[PDB]
Structure 1
Amino acid sequence: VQINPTPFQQGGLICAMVPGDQSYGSIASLTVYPHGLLNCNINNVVRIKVPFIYTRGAYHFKDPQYPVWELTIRVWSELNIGTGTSAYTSLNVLARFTDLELHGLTPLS
């Protein structure tokens, strides 16, 4: 995840890797997930490694049971500026696969 603050802005963001559901689990308990914490003070690019979390053996693309992973962005601390300071920041989410396995070839699309 790549964001970019100017250091006259303050605030914080959080990105969490959430499997299954955004159910009745707490927002203030989301540090138990493998997550990332963003700040307007120290750094602006973090990267997260997460495994395959799923009930069955493999994942079906043409008809999935449920999504394996899911990311959310909650406002971890509000964006406060002064006069003339930029009232925004940029945000990017990059993703790739690791240790890929492919099975079950199909002739159809």
Structure 2
Amino acid sequence: EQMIQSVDRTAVTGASYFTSVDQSSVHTAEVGSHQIEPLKTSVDKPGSKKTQGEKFFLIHSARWLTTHALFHEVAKLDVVKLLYNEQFAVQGLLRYHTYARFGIEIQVQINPTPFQQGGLICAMVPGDQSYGSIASLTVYPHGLLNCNINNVVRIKVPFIYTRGAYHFKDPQYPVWELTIRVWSELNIGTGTSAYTSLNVLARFTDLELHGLTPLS
């Protein structure tokens, strides 16, 4: 007894999310193999989620001057919204994926000349500075600045939000709001320079992606 087998009609193939089931199917032929390159024309790792979406991104550049009074808010911005911009590589991962869940890494670098004096504050505020005390900001995870000792601090805070995932197209409220206020006034004499720079390097940590969208 001989039997000539025929082609199967039903087939469940495709990709992760794009799912197709066909009634008229055929055998997918395959020749060759995925060839590796021994004399590597690229000595670093390829593009991946781990190295692209988590890397320090400059979001704002201001300049702390001498004419600022006490407890003047130097910077007032959204850490999440400034990372949503066309000029970054995190635009490439967040454009097709709507939902977002992430931790916030903060590193702020300033550069004073040592013939000045004064100090700053860098707190991480959830939501808004609605009725929080200026003098009680150290309860927040903060990092201070000094013209005597250091010029680099870092702050690692988790996702503080009323929900779990994030919507980019219509946010209810900003998730984090990085604040920088004048902790001590910047004084100079004669000849000492009356400017010193300020930069905020921010990046995401522990990103999830859910629910792909067709729209931009």
Instruction: State TM-score, norm by structure 2.
Output: 0.49
1:104 CA drift (Å): 1.4
Q: Give the drift of 1:35.
A: 1.0
Structure number with greater Rg is: 2
Query: Residue 97 of structure 1 aligns to a residue in which SS?
Result: strand
Note the alpha carbon deviations across 1:12-59, whole angstroms, 9 max, x for none: 011110111211121000001111101100001111111100011111
Unaligned runs of 5+ in 1: none
Q: If each structure's strand is expressed as a fraction of its own residues, which one has the higher value?
A: 2
Structure 1 stretches (4+) deviating beyond 2 angstroms? none
User: Could you tell me whether the CA contact under 8 Å between 2:128 and 2:174 is conserved in 1?
Assistant: no
Q: Which runs of 5+ in 2 are unaligned?
A: 1-107
Q: TM-score, normalised by structure 1?
A: 0.96
Does 2:64 correspond to 1:64? no
- Equivalent residue of 2:135, what SS? helix
Separation in 1, partners of 2:120, 2:195: 13
Post-superposition offset of 1:80: 0.8
Name the SS of the counterpart of 2:191 in structure 1.
coil
Distance 1:96 1:20 in 2: 18
> Aligned residues: percent identity?
100
What root-mean-square deviation, in Å, do the aligned CA atoms of Structure 1 and Structure 2 show? 0.8
| CA apart distance, 1:65 | 1.3
